Structure formats: structure tokens, C-alpha cells
Amino acid sequence: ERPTFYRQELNKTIWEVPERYQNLSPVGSYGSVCAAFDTKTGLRVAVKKLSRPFQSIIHAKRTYRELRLLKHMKHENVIGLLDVFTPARSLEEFNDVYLVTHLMGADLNQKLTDDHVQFLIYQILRGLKYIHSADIIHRDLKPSNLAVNEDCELKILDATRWYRAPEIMLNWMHYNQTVDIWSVGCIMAELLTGRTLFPGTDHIDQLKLILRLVGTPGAELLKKISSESARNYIQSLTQMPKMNFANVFIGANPLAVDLLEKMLVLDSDKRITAAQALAHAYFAQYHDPDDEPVADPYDQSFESRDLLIDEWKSLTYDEVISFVPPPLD
Ligand SMILES: Nc1ccc2c(NC3CC3)nc(-c3ccccc3)nc2c1
């Protein structure tokens, strides 16, 4: 049987949650999140109430997508689902979705020491290895999507353009997983210097700042570009030379500089992968081949489906029903 719920009004919204969760306190406003005490585990959790989860086809599918993704993620450097619930007793009543996860400290968004940079980028790459092994691309990696507790343990959660790979800016539709490695490079650079590596004011400025560091594309990359207008734009630009990173990141650990060179390669095909970066010398004190696990296969065949609102809603409901809490250990 389902547990006993209780209503209350927090900020704007009504909140109907199981008695299990106590002392709800707002932490910000996709949906709004409350901090809470979980009486079953004795841990602090974050409860997210999705807003209007089924108000349109796209909302409906987004709701399903988010629930599917969170139910899949089981890795210490990625956000996972402690609980999901609805106060509804039937599919017909069903209109609210709440998700529960570990309350984490602040987000990553100062100049940090080299050992702090090592450990944090290590953990990001370890989560990303896992995510990527599932054929999931994060696409929106940035400091505010990284939660860090006082113990410097990090979990991947969820201007965006500052961390975006140049092939996304240029609107290539066949970009792949290494768009995330680009973002890691921009994050790591920012941690090491205390400044945004590429703080473009728009998408055009963004590219200009990028190419000025990494150089304008050579013939070899230009020959893989299918869009004539895209090729025209970059081919019409002032041909910047690739900068010496050891000069640009003056004083940083030479191994950090070398990893940055391998992450921030213009050509997506020659960018280091998550698994490869983990074996890089910069992470010598943290890397362990037997504790960098891959994920179970993830079925995202639903991404290609076009369904009705009630159908996405019903798929989401099934997923709420089949949820198995993770082991209390
Ligand atoms: N194998 C590849 C590797 C890199 C690529 C890239 N990279 C952009 C220079 C940063 N851009 C594009 C592309 C194609 C059509 C429209 C817009 C962009 N394709 C690429 C194909």
C-alpha cells in the first residue's frame, strides 16, 4: 500500500509528499526543488516537483525522458534517484511527479589548487565515462551542473554557450559524445585560472574566441564539413594559428596543460575520450582501471517516437510504478 501524504503550500506551489519526508524548505525554482529530511534513511534529500509535467506533447515526453534517465543512472559521480512518487492513486488521477535525490552542497561555480583540480576533473571524467558508455550525451556540462559537497565529492546533475563545443555552435547535427569533453576542457581551464576560458557574448563572438585559441580549421577538418555555408563562414575567417597552450596556461602543471591540449581540439574526431583521459598521466594518483565502471545498456528508442500526450503520460506512470528503491547500505 502507498504511504500517507500531507499537503502544504511552499512559496507558490502546493506540495503533497509522503510523511516519510519532513521539514521541507525551498532552495530555488522544469520545476522547483525543496530541501527535506528523509526519515527512512536519516539523510538530507532534495525533492523536485515537476511543473505541468503533462501540459503538452513536448512536456510529456520531457517528463518521461527525465524519469527514464534518472532511473538509469547508478554511479557515484552521477545524480541518481532515491525515490519518485505521485500523490495519485490511479493513472486517471495522475498529474504530478516528484523526484527525490541526495541533497548535495554547492555547485562548482575561484582559483583552485592543482590537486583540487585533479580530483574534481577526475570525478567528472569518471561519471562521463559511465554516462557515455550508455550512449548518453550530457550536452549541457557547465559548473552549475556539477554538485560538490564539503568532502569534494562530485556528482554530475541534469551562460551555456561558454562551455559549448564549436561543432554545436556551428549547428552540426551529427555531433557525438566528445562535445562533453570540450565542456570538461573549458571547466578545467576555468578551475585552473579562475576565469571563463571562452566568455563569448553571442554564438559568433563565441566561435571567434575559440578559434583564436585553437586555430582556424585546417584543410583536413574542412574536408569533413558537409554544409557549404558553414564551410564558407570558417573559410572566410581570419586564419588564426593554434596557440601554444603551455604559454597560455603559464605556470600550470605541464600535465594539466597537456590534457587541456587533448580535450580542446577543434576536430571532434581527434578529441580525447572520457575513458582515454582517465588513463592520462595528470590523474596518476586517482586513476584505477578496476573502479571506473561502465553502465548497463540504455534504450532511448523512444526518442524517435511521436506519441500522444496521454501515451507519454501513461509510459511515465508505468515508470513511477516499476521504480525499485536503491539498497539502503
Ligand atoms: N567529422 C567532423 C568533424 C568536425 C565537424 C565540425 N566541427 C566544427 C569546426 C568545429 N563541424 C561540422 C559541421 C558540418 C555541417 C554544418 C556545421 C558543422 N562537421 C564536422 C564533421
Ligand SMILES: O=C(OCc1ccccc1)c1cccnc1
Ligand atoms: O536542486 C536540486 O535538486 C534537483 C533534483 C534533481 C533530480 C531529482 C531530484 C532533485 C539539488 C541537487 C543536488 C543537491 N542539492 C539540490
